[PDB]
Amino acid sequence: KFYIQEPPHGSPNWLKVGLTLGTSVFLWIYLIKQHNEDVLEYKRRN
Amino acid sequence: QPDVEWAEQYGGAVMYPTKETAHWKPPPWNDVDPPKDTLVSNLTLN
Amino acid sequence: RWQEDPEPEDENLYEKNPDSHGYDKDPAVDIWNMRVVFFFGFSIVLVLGSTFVAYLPDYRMQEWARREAERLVKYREAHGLPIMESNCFDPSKIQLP
Amino acid sequence: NPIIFIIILLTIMLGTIIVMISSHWLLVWIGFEMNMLAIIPIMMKNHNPRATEASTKYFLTQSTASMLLMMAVIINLMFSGQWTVMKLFNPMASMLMTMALAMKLGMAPFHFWVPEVTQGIPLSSGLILLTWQKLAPMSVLYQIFPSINLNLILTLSVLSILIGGWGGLNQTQLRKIMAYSSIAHMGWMTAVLPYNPTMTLLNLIIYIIMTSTMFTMFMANSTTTTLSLSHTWNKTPIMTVLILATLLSMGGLPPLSGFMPKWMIIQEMTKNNSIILPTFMAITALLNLYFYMRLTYSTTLTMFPSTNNMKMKWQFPLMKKMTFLPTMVVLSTMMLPLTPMLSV
Amino acid sequence: XXXXXXXXXXXXXXXXXXXXXXXXXXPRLAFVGFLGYCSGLIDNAIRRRPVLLAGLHRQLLYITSFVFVGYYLLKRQDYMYAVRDHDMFSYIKSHXXXXXXXXXXXXXXXXXXX
Amino acid sequence: XXXXXXXXXXXXXXXXXXXXXQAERLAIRSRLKREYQLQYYDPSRRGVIEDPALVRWTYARSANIYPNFRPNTKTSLLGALFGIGPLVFWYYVFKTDRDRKEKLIQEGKLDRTFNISY
Amino acid sequence: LLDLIWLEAILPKTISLAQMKASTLVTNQKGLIKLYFLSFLITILISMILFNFH
Amino acid sequence: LLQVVRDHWVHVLVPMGFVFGYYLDRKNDEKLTAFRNKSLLYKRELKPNEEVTW
Amino acid sequence: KYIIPTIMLMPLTWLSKNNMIWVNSTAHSLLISFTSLLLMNQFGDNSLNFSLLFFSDSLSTPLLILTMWLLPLMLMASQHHLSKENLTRKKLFITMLISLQLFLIMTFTAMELILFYILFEATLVPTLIIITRWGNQTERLNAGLYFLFYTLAGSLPLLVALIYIQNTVGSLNFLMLQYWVQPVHNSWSNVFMWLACMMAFMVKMPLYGLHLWLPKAHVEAPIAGSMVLAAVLLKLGGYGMLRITLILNPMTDFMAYPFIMLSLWGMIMTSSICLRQTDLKSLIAYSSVSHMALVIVAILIQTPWSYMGATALMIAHGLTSSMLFCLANSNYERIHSRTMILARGLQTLLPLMATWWLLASLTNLALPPTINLIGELFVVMSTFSWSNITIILMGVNMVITALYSLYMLIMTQRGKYTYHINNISPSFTRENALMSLHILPLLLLTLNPKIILGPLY
Amino acid sequence: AKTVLRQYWDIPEGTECHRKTYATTSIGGAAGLVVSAYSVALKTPTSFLEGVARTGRYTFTAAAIGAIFGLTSCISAQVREKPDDPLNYLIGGCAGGLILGARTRSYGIGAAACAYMGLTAALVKMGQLEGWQVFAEP
Amino acid sequence: XXXXXXXXXXXXXXXXXXXXXXXXXXXXXXXXXXXXXXXXXXXXXXXXXXXXXXXXXXXXXXXXXXXXXXXXXXXXXXXXXXXXXXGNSYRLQAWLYASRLLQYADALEHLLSTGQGVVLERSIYSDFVFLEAMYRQGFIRKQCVDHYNQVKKVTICEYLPPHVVVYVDVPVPEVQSRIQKKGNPHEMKITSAYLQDIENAYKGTFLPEMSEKCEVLQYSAWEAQDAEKVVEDIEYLKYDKGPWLDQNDRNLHKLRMLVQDKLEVLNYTSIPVFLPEVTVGAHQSDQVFQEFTELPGRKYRAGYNEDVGDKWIW
């Protein structure tokens, strides 16, 4: 069949697919850095 | 199973058959068109 | 007029094109399910589970209370006059009214 | 409507910010009017004979309503003097103030415009805006909840669920059912305002998300019960499961997120020694469920809406948050027990 | 408390009081994380795509967004419950007359028949 | 129910109207039997036959509840006295027995000394 | 009498009367902005005269 | 190795789900550490083992 | 230990291939039910709490084991149905049972009243979807709406009841903490406090008044007969009457007096109708009213002997009525109608199933001590200490207990079957296995019924 | 006015009912005028001739409900002992719902919902004790 | 979100020799179909004539659906030997109207984005001529006509321009002899009264089309089959007073959004009203939906599909 009359999505976009996988990396590093900072602040206070 | 006769009971009119107000007709599928005419349209001068 | 309403047909496995089965379609699926794992629960939950139920792990002080009662009877009979019950958990209460 | 349509939509977003961040009584009047001049164009859009009638009915019932608010603003100059949105002070000013707020939120004697205005919108995008506009005058009520006489605020809450619980029964128009679902939920809004200011804003968080999910499920065009009926068999069958889940949460049912506001409304009211009023709230809540119950019979039952015309091509709507928000709308009972404190 | 008296109005999280320590890998966070995965399952029901579980790998965005917002949302939950308790204990300490203590009794109660 | 004489062969006449009356009964009896005869005597069937008379018999008790009862009259109120009534009948029986028992516990003991169960 | 009609007549009693109360709101007032605004005249008078508050 | 892994994939999850439930529900006792040696009912002094029993 | 492996049944049915499904759902459920008996049975003098208050221990609930017993059994009889339709539809209505099993475990385990309430009404949602779909006969909605508007109309008054207690008297929570509760002073303001806690459980446990909730759910069959076993679980699902009457209102029994008299007439009149009825499923539906009416009598007496009979009857009825409905389903799958008179013929066509028909019928009567003799007789013995008059009314009911069972037997024990040509194969290997998995657990309870009745036993 | 409603609670403390019956007409009369005001929105034909006709049927019947309720409560108080009871007002509540069947020739409706109206009327005097509160602050 | 601030905009790189042409209403015999193929000398793209399998011609993937999968009881050969009570009759024509409306939306989408002249064989403004010819004889009931007029009022008004270039061919009354000479045996032995009414209704269809100030050129049988004569006539004639000359910013952007999506254009095409010749039965609809999902074509739908393409998981 090979999807006739041109499909709306080819499947690899890279412009949209690449950044969406990139945003998860930006979120994961940001959360652990504040997590270590919160424990360091709690130990300094108490 | 529910048939076409059951769908006509819940058809677009009044949900509940009308007691006094039954003259009100059902609205169009994608925004009703009202009066095409009943307008002056172009002025005449002597 | 019905148009498309008439479609109902009687269906039964029975024995025709099944020989002897319980599961609908395929002889390979039937034997491995309806006679093996159907009866594996019959062997573990019923037969191996019969050892438990209430027999073995005491079950809410049913066997413990008998040994506890007998030693309390012989102790109170030799020294005291009243047998077990006389004033249950009451020793010098702060008035009433 | 090209680029400037986003700018018109932005002024409603910015308009509520003026109401949110405010200390002056004339500043919120500006904030309300920022919405007045910006909703009407989206109410019209395509220009229809039904749209012209709805926009005029939306204007006249709401512009006169805000004009009653300006009287209460001017009584705050005659009495108590200061221009601050902290307290209402005068009982004479509060009577005209609460009735002006009732014209937008209380609804019990001012519902009349809602079923006609909500039906009159030609587009699904305009349906979201009316459920989002209700956030604006709630910010005013959260500021001046003391001093206002509770005898004529709780009447606007009790009567609203009565007229909301009866006003959806004789309606087949899908926009009209959601119009009376507003008034039914607005009774719960004007009940927590006298009894503990918190959870009143969380009632909005539950409601607005639940209503925004509802109309975005109607991105596949449906205006009547019979038009939403032909969806299970002809159209997408898995889509109607999410319509079922959102409708079940709209009424008071425990394993869904929509029961979680109904928890604290009664809880805080019972703490204030009142039992006879919250009982009446629970019985009238059953009448609300009935509209959603009949509308779930378009998703559960067969109902025979097959039709000759069939769709094969995949549907591509807008769907801004029609995937993330229904998951919060279906299940948030275990997720949000201590979250009452997080909002306010 | 609903109205702020000691706490600063309009805060990103708290900032005035930071010392509390947020929960690490909590059972509460796992349920919000499960809903992030659940939102990435029913999105393929709307836009008809093959397999809900083994479909598009844009699900990672849906899980992370629920965790990131949820972590901040639960941080306020631990903060607001602490302030609620802090003002409660301070009310007893400052007034003292409002609270009363009673311990050890010998009072008669009515007994039920049948 | 039975009369003075048991009905089995009492009061029978040939006449002309009674002769046609038995002809009317056999006309329906043979008609419903032949459609059973066409359904029973073939190997191609295999299954349980419906019969419209038996389905309507089950439908008489399971359904036709709220289509009826629209003339309530005085017959429905007599049935209510036979239903809700006997519930009020035992209210003056169980209470009188309990008030007899409760008075005995406080003054003039009637309960047995060798009683411990419940 | 009882097990199908009278003992049932608790919730159908609050359906037959509920639908009668439902019809007095939906089918009532056949459109018209005129009629809805005539009802708002009374609502202010209830809060001022009938209910004692200011 | 190829015949077993391809055919069975869901069959392993249920008995492993019991072990996962066994570990999670047991570790909840570590949150409730209060009253371990205190209150004389099953209290005993430690000789070799630390904190009696978990 | 209990929850989590039950939740893992949801990804099990969906991930597995289309040819299997039923093999994985039944086999994996049986090994979880074995582990429930392994741990829950252990208790001291007073049953000590399991963990933190999410799911707690059992004090007087061996009824959880019954839910685990039906956990695979609610899949065995539903095999005849659902097979004709789509593969995606099969997976959906197995997971609705898994969701039922998820919420039903939570009700009996968690020692609460506040969070118990949001699990009490939570069982109604999956059953509603179950009843409103797959119904072969019509009026699904005239039973589906009646399923909620009987229960929710009575149970929503718990929100104004339970919260009112915790706002005044400490907190409900653990129940093991609930000793703060002071006896009620008995006043006209305290009348609606007691009624709101009772009326919720007066619907699920059927009486004489407001009892029509149950026959509509049974006659209009959800799916085949395996979902009717879940409708039996809903009757015993209102077990909180054991907990509320003992703790929340100990002094209040004067207002219980009219409610006993209502349930006492819900024994003669409910049995009389259960004689001349046409439907085979209805003659189990009305016998289930009277059998559960015995429990309601026992609760409101509040004697220590009555709770022994109450806890026994919850398990006794939970495996005898469900057994009877499986026999009703086995005739419904062959004859295709629930009529008793039309479906006539045992031993001649159904040789081995007729012995299962006998064992199921006689268990409704007082046989050699299986569970129902420990159930029914214990209540009758406890009613005499309440009042001497009771056994004059209760003895008449013992005559008509035979008239449920024997009338179901005799109207099927005629070897005519002239109109019927179907039912060639008597029973499949799974169909005979269903009948054994209901009676043989009760036959094992003959040796030790300690795990059948245990409120301080 | 709430001052009119507060007068209703002070009289039944004694035995006098001659002024209590006069006070009950103002409660039912003013409440009837509220429903009479909303019925104007149904569009009345002509002017004044039919306008008074619609107001006449609603106000006179609603005042009659309150007037009989005040009378029947005092007859039930004078006959036998007991000052105030929910059972005492239940008999008076049944008489108030009985006269609704006199409005239209059908014998039922009012008599059909006589137990429903009688129970709701009893619920008003159920809240004479401290246990029931309609509106509360703390 | 729709982008209008970007480089891609309406009216730009269009309108200059890009207007749509239609050769419609030329009896039962396909005479306009041959002349339309030669008319694509000035125009860039040419579209094929719509039949029963016209919506499924492209749709998802290449091959068309087989008989029952596309539409229940729909065949062009079946309409030649038309039968009353239980059959095709109207539901084929309702499917025929929906198919022509769908291909018109894609042709307008091809016109708006990248300015290319698209010639359509038998437009949506020609289907009412085909219906009314059969209505004169005893075939279609009066109630089915009211069902057609309700769809007619809604679907047409949403699209702003009808057609700039209109070609109407009026042949001889002995057109049935030309149809008998054609290669198709199933199309032969058609009613002469239906063909005569089709020419009569076309006479009252060209006049309202000219009343809306749309350019129309009449050609006879002797004037037919000409490439040079047809191209020179369309180029010389200037578009005036027509409704095609609309707003470039507001009007052109709104019509483009409705034409872009196939599901949005056919959303108003399906009517909530029930009709006997429309197939309302849900039992047949459940079996048809199961077979379409099991089909190797769409199955999972929208780009990604197992055992058909499958490029990436993400």
PDB file of C-alpha atoms in Angstrom, chain B residues 2, chain D residues 174 214 217-218 222 225-233 236-248 291-305, chain I residues 92-93 128-129 132-133 140-141:
ATOM      1  CA  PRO B   2     -32.005   1.660  20.374  1.00  0.00           C
TER       2      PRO B   2
ATOM      3  CA  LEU D 174     -26.401  20.533  24.037  1.00  0.00           C
ATOM      4  CA  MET D 214     -16.529  19.171  27.893  1.00  0.00           C
ATOM      5  CA  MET D 217     -14.960  16.963  23.320  1.00  0.00           C
ATOM      6  CA  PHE D 218     -17.614  18.720  21.199  1.00  0.00           C
ATOM      7  CA  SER D 222     -22.636  18.565  17.960  1.00  0.00           C
ATOM      8  CA  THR D 225     -28.649  15.358  21.938  1.00  0.00           C
ATOM      9  CA  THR D 226     -29.475  13.564  18.652  1.00  0.00           C
ATOM     10  CA  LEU D 227     -26.347  15.022  16.983  1.00  0.00           C
ATOM     11  CA  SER D 228     -24.153  13.818  19.881  1.00  0.00           C
ATOM     12  CA  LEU D 229     -26.023  10.475  19.664  1.00  0.00           C
ATOM     13  CA  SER D 230     -24.401   9.632  16.307  1.00  0.00           C
ATOM     14  CA  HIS D 231     -20.858   9.358  17.707  1.00  0.00           C
ATOM     15  CA  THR D 232     -20.410   5.832  19.138  1.00  0.00           C
ATOM     16  CA  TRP D 233     -21.182   3.793  16.004  1.00  0.00           C
ATOM     17  CA  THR D 236     -14.890   7.485  16.967  1.00  0.00           C
ATOM     18  CA  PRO D 237     -16.028   4.939  19.631  1.00  0.00           C
ATOM     19  CA  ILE D 238     -13.076   5.386  22.052  1.00  0.00           C
ATOM     20  CA  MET D 239     -13.709   9.169  22.210  1.00  0.00           C
ATOM     21  CA  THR D 240     -17.151   8.618  23.808  1.00  0.00           C
ATOM     22  CA  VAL D 241     -15.538   6.877  26.826  1.00  0.00           C
ATOM     23  CA  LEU D 242     -13.908  10.219  27.770  1.00  0.00           C
ATOM     24  CA  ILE D 243     -17.260  12.010  27.246  1.00  0.00           C
ATOM     25  CA  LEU D 244     -18.820   9.409  29.596  1.00  0.00           C
ATOM     26  CA  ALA D 245     -16.068   9.934  32.219  1.00  0.00           C
ATOM     27  CA  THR D 246     -16.371  13.755  32.176  1.00  0.00           C
ATOM     28  CA  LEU D 247     -20.195  13.651  32.419  1.00  0.00           C
ATOM     29  CA  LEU D 248     -20.085  11.236  35.387  1.00  0.00           C
ATOM     30  CA  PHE D 291     -29.125  15.779  32.754  1.00  0.00           C
ATOM     31  CA  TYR D 292     -25.715  14.079  32.593  1.00  0.00           C
ATOM     32  CA  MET D 293     -27.415  10.678  33.060  1.00  0.00           C
ATOM     33  CA  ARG D 294     -29.574  11.147  29.936  1.00  0.00           C
ATOM     34  CA  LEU D 295     -26.529  12.477  28.045  1.00  0.00           C
ATOM     35  CA  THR D 296     -24.504   9.359  28.995  1.00  0.00           C
ATOM     36  CA  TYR D 297     -27.235   7.310  27.251  1.00  0.00           C
ATOM     37  CA  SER D 298     -25.889   8.663  23.942  1.00  0.00           C
ATOM     38  CA  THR D 299     -22.585   6.950  24.859  1.00  0.00           C
ATOM     39  CA  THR D 300     -23.778   3.737  26.593  1.00  0.00           C
ATOM     40  CA  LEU D 301     -26.986   2.703  24.767  1.00  0.00           C
ATOM     41  CA  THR D 302     -27.431   1.790  21.071  1.00  0.00           C
ATOM     42  CA  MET D 303     -30.164   4.427  20.349  1.00  0.00           C
ATOM     43  CA  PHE D 304     -30.008   3.722  16.552  1.00  0.00           C
ATOM     44  CA  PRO D 305     -28.274   6.776  14.974  1.00  0.00           C
TER      45      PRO D 305
ATOM     46  CA  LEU I  92     -13.236  -4.043  28.795  1.00  0.00           C
ATOM     47  CA  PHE I  93     -15.746  -6.121  30.799  1.00  0.00           C
ATOM     48  CA  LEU I 128     -24.015   0.233  36.569  1.00  0.00           C
ATOM     49  CA  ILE I 129     -22.051  -0.090  33.286  1.00  0.00           C
ATOM     50  CA  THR I 132     -26.880  -1.310  31.465  1.00  0.00           C
ATOM     51  CA  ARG I 133     -24.976  -3.286  28.790  1.00  0.00           C
ATOM     52  CA  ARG I 140     -32.185  -2.400  31.231  1.00  0.00           C
ATOM     53  CA  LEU I 141     -32.723   1.294  32.057  1.00  0.00           C
TER      54      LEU I 141
END
